[PDB]
Amino acid sequence: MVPISPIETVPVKLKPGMDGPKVKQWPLTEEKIKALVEICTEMEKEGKISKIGPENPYNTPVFAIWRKLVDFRELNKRTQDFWEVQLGIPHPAGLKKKKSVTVLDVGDAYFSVPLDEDFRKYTAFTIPSINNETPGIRYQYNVLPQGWKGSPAIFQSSMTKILEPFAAQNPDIVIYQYMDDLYVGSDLEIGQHRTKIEELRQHLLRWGLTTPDKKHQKEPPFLWMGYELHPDKWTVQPIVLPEKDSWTVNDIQKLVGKLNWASQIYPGIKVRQLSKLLRGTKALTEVIPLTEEAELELAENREILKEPVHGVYYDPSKDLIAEIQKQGQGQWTYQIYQEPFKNLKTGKYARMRGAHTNDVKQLTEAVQKITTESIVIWGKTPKFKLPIQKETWETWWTEYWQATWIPEWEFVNTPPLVKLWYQLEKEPIVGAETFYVDGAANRETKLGKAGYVTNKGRQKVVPLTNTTNQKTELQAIYLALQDSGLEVNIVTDSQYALGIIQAQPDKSESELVNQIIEQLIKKEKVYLAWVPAHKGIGGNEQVDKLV
Amino acid sequence: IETVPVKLKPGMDGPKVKQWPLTEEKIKALVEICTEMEKEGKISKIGPENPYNTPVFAIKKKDSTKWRKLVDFRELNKRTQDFWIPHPAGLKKKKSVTVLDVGDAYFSVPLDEDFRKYTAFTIPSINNETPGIRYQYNVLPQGWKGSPAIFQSSMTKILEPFKKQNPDIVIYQYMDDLYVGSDLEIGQHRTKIEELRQHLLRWYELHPDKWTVQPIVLPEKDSWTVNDIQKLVGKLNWASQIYPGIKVRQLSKLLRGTKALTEVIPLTEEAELELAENREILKEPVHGVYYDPSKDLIAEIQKQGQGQWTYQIYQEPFKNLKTGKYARMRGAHTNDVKQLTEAVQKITTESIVIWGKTPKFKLPIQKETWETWWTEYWQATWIPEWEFVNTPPLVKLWYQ
Ligand SMILES: Cc1c(Oc2ccccc2OCCn2ccc(=O)[nH]c2=O)cc(N(C)C(=O)CCl)c2ccc(C#N)cc12
Numbered sequence: 022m023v024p025i026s027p028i029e030t031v032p033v034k035l036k037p038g039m040d041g042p043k044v045k046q047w048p049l050t051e052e053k054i055k056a057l058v059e060i061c062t063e064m065e066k067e068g069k070i071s072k073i074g075p076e077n078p079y080n081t082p083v084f085a086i087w088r089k090l091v092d093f094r095e096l097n098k099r100t101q102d103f104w105e106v107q108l109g110i111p112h113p114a115g116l117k118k119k120k121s122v123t124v125l126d127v128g129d130a131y132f133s134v135p136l137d138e139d140f141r142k143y144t145a146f147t148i149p150s151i152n153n154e155t156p157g158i159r160y161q162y163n164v165l166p167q168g169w170k171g172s173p174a175i176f177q178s179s180m181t182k183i184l185e186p187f188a189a190q191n192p193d194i195v196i197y198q199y200m201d202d203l204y205v206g207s208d209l210e211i212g213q214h215r216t217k218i219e220e221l222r223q224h225l226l227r228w229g230l231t232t233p234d235k236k237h238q239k240e241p242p243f244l245w246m247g248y249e250l251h252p253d254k255w256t257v258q259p260i261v262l263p264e265k266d267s268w269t270v271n272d273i274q275k276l277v278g279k280l281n282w283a284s285q286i287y288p289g290i291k292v293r294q295l296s297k298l299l300r301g302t303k304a305l306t307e308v309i310p311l312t313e314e315a316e317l318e319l320a321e322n323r324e325i326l327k328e329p330v331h332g333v334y335y336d337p338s339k340d341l342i343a344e345i346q347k348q349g350q351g352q353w354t355y356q357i358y359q360e361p362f363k364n365l366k367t368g369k370y371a372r373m374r375g376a377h378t379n380d381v382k383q384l385t386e387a388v389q390k391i392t393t394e395s396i397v398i399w400g401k402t403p404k405f406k407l408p409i410q411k412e413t414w415e416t417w418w419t420e421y422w423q424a425t426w427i428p429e430w431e432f433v434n435t436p437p438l439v440k441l442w443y444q445l446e447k448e449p450i451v452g453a454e455t456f457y458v459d460g461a462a463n464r465e466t467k468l469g470k471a472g473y474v475t476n477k478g479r480q481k482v483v484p485l486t487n488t489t490n491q492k493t494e495l496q497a498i499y500l501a502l503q504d505s506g507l508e509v510n511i512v513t514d515s516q517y518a519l520g521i522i523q524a525q526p527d528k529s530e531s532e533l534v535n536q537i538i539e540q541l542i543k544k545e546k547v548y549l550a551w552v553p554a555h556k557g558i559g560g561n562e563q564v565d566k567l568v
Numbered sequence: 569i570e571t572v573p574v575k576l577k578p579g580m581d582g583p584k585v586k587q588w589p590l591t592e593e594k595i596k597a598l599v600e601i602c603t604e605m606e607k608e609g610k611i612s613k614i615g616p617e618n619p620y621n622t623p624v625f626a627i628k629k630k631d632s633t634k635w636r637k638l639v640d641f642r643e644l645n646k647r648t649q650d651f652w653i654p655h656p657a658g659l660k661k662k663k664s665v666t667v668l669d670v671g672d673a674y675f676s677v678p679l680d681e682d683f684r685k686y687t688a689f690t691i692p693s694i695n696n697e698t699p700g701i702r703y704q705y706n707v708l709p710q711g712w713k714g715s716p717a718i719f720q721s722s723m724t725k726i727l728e729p730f731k732k733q734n735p736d737i738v739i740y741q742y743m744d745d746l747y748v749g750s751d752l753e754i755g756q757h758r759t760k761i762e763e764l765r766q767h768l769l770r771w772y773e774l775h776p777d778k779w780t781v782q783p784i785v786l787p788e789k790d791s792w793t794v795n796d797i798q799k800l801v802g803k804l805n806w807a808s809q810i811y812p813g814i815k816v817r818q819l820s821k822l823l824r825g826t827k828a829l830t831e832v833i834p835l836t837e838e839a840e841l842e843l844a845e846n847r848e849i850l851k852e853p854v855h856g857v858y859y860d861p862s863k864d865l866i867a868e869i870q871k872q873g874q875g876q877w878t879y880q881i882y883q884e885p886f887k888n889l890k891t892g893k894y895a896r897m898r899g900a901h902t903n904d905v906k907q908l909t910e911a912v913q914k915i916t917t918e919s920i921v922i923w924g925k926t927p928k929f930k931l932p933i934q935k936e937t938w939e940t941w942w943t944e945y946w947q948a949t950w951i952p953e954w955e956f957v958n959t960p961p962l963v964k965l966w967y968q
Contacts (some may be wrong), residue, residue: 061766101617104702175615423934424905424933426906455826476826476828524577550799557820557824560823560826561823
C-alpha cells in the first residue's frame with residue numbers, strides 16, 4: 022500500500038459557555054430503520070462514522086428519504102463561528118480567457134477530510150431499533166458531516182492547503198475551487214493541458230483523494246448562478262418577461278428581479294416605475310394596477326431584452342473604460358468595456374432617498390459606485406467617459422462647499438448633458454433691485470403671510486392658508502424672484518432657505534423649491550444675502566408679515 | 569522575551585470587520601510584505617477556525633518608493649482592555665518637535681499566545697477568486713494600542729541614557745511615533761535627531777511655537793456699504809454666542825430702511841463706539857475654556873476654497889480649545905479629497921501633541937466619496953474617527 026499523507030485537522034470548539042446538542046431521536050418506520058442500518062453499516066465499513074458506547078450524552082436526530090439525512094441545526098446553533106468560506110461570488114466579467122478549461126470532481130474528497138477528534142463526540146446520532154426493544158445503534162462522525170456549520174470552510178481550507186504547492190510549482194495554469202468541483206484553466210497546448218490535469222490528479226491522489234477518470238458531466242456552456250459561461254464570452258441565463266393581463270405584487274417582484282439581474286449585461290434597463298409600484302405595500306398577494314409610466318418602461322425593457330447580448334472576458338493588457346449616461350428621474354446607466362461595442366458588463370444607479378438633489382451629485386455617486394465595483398472585479402479603477410463638460414465640473418468642484426473628486430475622466434457628448442442650471446453671485450450686484458423678503462405663520466391656525474419690500478419702494482404681502490414658517494420663507498423668496506428683473510439682490514433671515522439653496526439643488530420633493538429653481542434658471546444674476554432676524558435690521562420687516 | 573497576559577474588555581468578543589476591496593498593486597505589495605514578515609516569524613498563517621478580522625491596506629510614506637502595510641486596528645483598539653503617564657504639557661510649548669517612526673522596535677517583543685487570534689487580518693483576492701490570505705500576528709503589531717503600553721518599559725530602558733544626558737529635551741510616545749521636542753537650531757536639531765536615531769539603532773520638522781490660537785477679527789473700512797454692515801452684524805451676532813457683551817443694536821440702527829445693498833452708509837458715532845467695544849471684547853480670550861480628559865475632542869473642518877481650509881477643535885459648542893487654518897499646497901492643487909486627508913492628518917498630529925489623543929472629525933464630504941478615496945492619500949500610522957456633515961454650515965465665512 023502506498024502511504025497516504027494525513028490531512029491536518031482543524032481545531033473546532035463550541036460557542037463559549039454552551040454545551041453539545043441533546044435532541045430526542047425521531048421515531049422511524051421499520052423500513053427506514055433497515056435502510057439507515059444498511060447505509061450506516063457501509064459508512065462504518067468505509068470509515069466515515071464509528072460506533073460509540075453509552076457514555077456519550079449527546080444526540081442528533083437522523084432521517085432517511087434510501088438516503089441518510091442528519092439534522093444538525095441544533096449543533097449548528099451551538100458551533101463556533103468560522104471564517105466565511107467565500108466573502109462573495111466572482112463575476113464572469115473578471116475572468117480571463119483561457120484556451121482550455123477542465124472540470125474535476127473532488128466530491129469523494131469531501132468525506133475524506135477528517136474531523137477534530139475532541140469534537141466528534143458532538144456529532145453523535147442514534148438509529149432507533151426495531152420496535153424499540155433494543156438500544157439504538159450509536160454512531161459518531163469521523164469526517165466533516167454534510168450539513169454541519171463548519172464543513173464548507175474546513176473543506177475549502179484543507180483543499181486550498183493541498184493545492185498550494187501544485188499551483189505554486191505551476192504558475193502557467195489557474196486552479197479554482199467551488200464546492201466539490203475544481204476548475205483548471207490554461208493557455209497551453211491541449212496535450213500539455215491534459216498532461217498537467219493528470220499531474221493534478223496524481224498530486225491529489227498523494228492525499229488519497231480520487232478524481233473520477235469518467236468524463237465529467239459539466240461542459241460548455243457552463244450554467245452557474247444564473248450565468249452562461251462560454252469559451253469566448255459570458256451572459257446571463259435567458260430572461261423572459263412574461264405576458265400578464267394583471268400583475269400582482271410577486272409578479273412585479275419577479276419582474277424587477279429579472280430586470281435587476283439582466284441589467285448587468287443588458288444596457289438601458291430601467292426599474293424606477295415598476296419598483297415604485299411596490300413602495301409601501303408589504304402584501305405579497307396584492308394586485309396593483311400598472312401606471313402608464315410603468316407600461317412604457319416595461320415596453321422599453323421588452324425592446325431591450327428582445328435579442329441576446331453577451332459580455333466579453335477581461336483582458337488585462339487593455340485599458341478599462343466606463344461610460345455613463347443619464348436616463349432621467351434619478352436613473353443612470355453605465356457600460357464597462359475595453360474595446361468599443363464589446364462590453365465587459367453594464368449596470369445602473371438610482372439616486373438615493375433625498376429631499377433635494379442635483380445631477381452632478383448623482384453622477385459623482387454613480388462614479389464612486391462604478392469605481393468600487395471595478396476595484397472588486399478587476400482590481401483597478403477604470404477611465405471614465407462622462408456626459409459633463411470639463412468646465413462644468415471645474416466650476417462645480419471649485420465652488421462647492423463640500424470636498425469632492427472623481428478619478429481620471431474625459432467628456433463624451435452624449436445628451437442629456439449634466440450641467441449647472443444656476444450660479445449665485447459672490448458679491449452684491451450694482452444697479453440691481455434689492456428685495457428684503459420675509460414670511461411668517463401661526464402655529465395654530467396655520468395662517469401666514471409672505472412678501473418683500475424693495476429699495477425702489479416696491480412691496481408685496483400675500484396671505485396664505487395652511488402653511489408653516491419655513492414654507493412662508495421659501496414663498497417670500499419665490500415672490501421676490503417672480504417680480505424682479507433679470508438681476509436681483511435678495512435679503513432673507515431664513516437659515517432654512519439658505520440651507521436649501523446653498524446645497525444647489527436642481528430638483529426637489531417640494532413643488533415650491535422646484536418653482537424657486539425654475540425662477541433661478543431664468544435669472545441672469547442672483548445674489549442671496551442672509552441677516553439675523555429680530556435684530557432691528559431695517560428693510561427686513563418681520564412686523565409686515567406678522568399682521 | 570517574555571509575554572505579558574493581554575485580554576479584552578468584559579462581555580466583548582474579538583473584532584470582526586469586513587476587509588474592503590484593494591487595487592491589484594496594493595494586494596501584490598501586501599503579498600510581498602507579508603511573505604517577508606512570515607519568513608521573519610512576525611506573522612503566521614491561520615485556518616478557518618479564526619472568525620476575527622481587522623482591515624488592512626497599503627500606503628507609501630513621505631520620501632519613499634517602498635510600500636508599507638497599514639492595519640486599521642480601530643475596532644480592536646476600542647475592544648482592547650484599558651492599559652495603565654500624564655501627558656507632557658510642555659511638549660506643545662517647545663520650539664520644535666520631531667516625529668520618529670519606532671514601529672520596527674515592536675516586532676522584537678512576542679505577543680501573548682491566547683491574544684494573537686484577535687489580530688487576524690486578510691489579504692483579499694481580486695474578484696473573490698480565492699478565499700484571501702489569512703494571517704495573525706506573533707509579535708506586537710504596529711497600530712495596536714497595547715504595543716506602546718507593553719513596550720513602555722523597554723522604551724524607558726533604551727531612552728534612559730539620552731534622557732539623562734539632555735534634561736532639556738522632551739520625549740513623548742504615541743502609538744508607533746516618538747515626539748522629540750527641544751529649543752535648538754534646525755541644524756543642531758537635525759544632528760541631535762540623527763544622534764537619537766543612531767542611539768536607538770544599536771539597541772518631519774514641526775514647530776508648535778509658530779502655532780497660536782486665532783482671534784475673531786472684524787473689518788477695518790473707511791466706507792461701509794449696506795452689505796458690509798449686514799455681514800458685520802451677522803458675524804457679531806454669531807460671536808455673541810461665544811462672547812457675552814457683544815452689542816449690535818447701534819450697528820443694526822444704520823440698517824433701518826430699505827436701501828440698496830451696494831449703497832455706502834456712513835457710520836454714526838454710536839456705531840463706531842459699539843464696533844470698538846466689540847473689537848476690545850474680541851481681543852480677550854473666551855471665558856471658562858478648559859480641557860476635560862474624560863470627554864471626546866471634536867474637530868470641524870470647513871473648505872474655504874483656493875486650497876484654504878479652516879478647522880476648530882473643541883469639546884463643548886462655542887468653547888474652542890484650538891483653531892487653525894491649513895492652506896498648505898503640496899501636490900494636491902487639483903484634488904479636494906487629498907487636501908482634506910492631509911488636513912485631517914495634520915490636525916490629528918497637532919491634537920496628539922497637545923492632548924495626547926485623537927479627535928473625532930466632522931468632515932465636509934459625502935460618505936461615499938471619502939470612504940472611496942481617503943486611503944489613497946493616508947500616510948500616518950494611526951487613524952481617527954470621523955462622521956459626515958451633509959448640510960452647509962452658515963458659519964463657514966465667519967471663519968474666513
Ligand atoms: C468554467 C468556470 C470558470 O472558468 C475558469 C476556470 C479556471 C480558469 C479560468 C476560467 O475562466 C476563464 C474564462 N472562461 C470561462 C469558460 C470557458 O469555457 N473558457 C474561458 O476562458 C470559472 C468559474 N467561476 C465563476 C469561479 O469562481 C471558479 Cl470556481 C466557474 C464556476 C462554475 C462553473 C460550473 N459549472 C464553471 C466555472
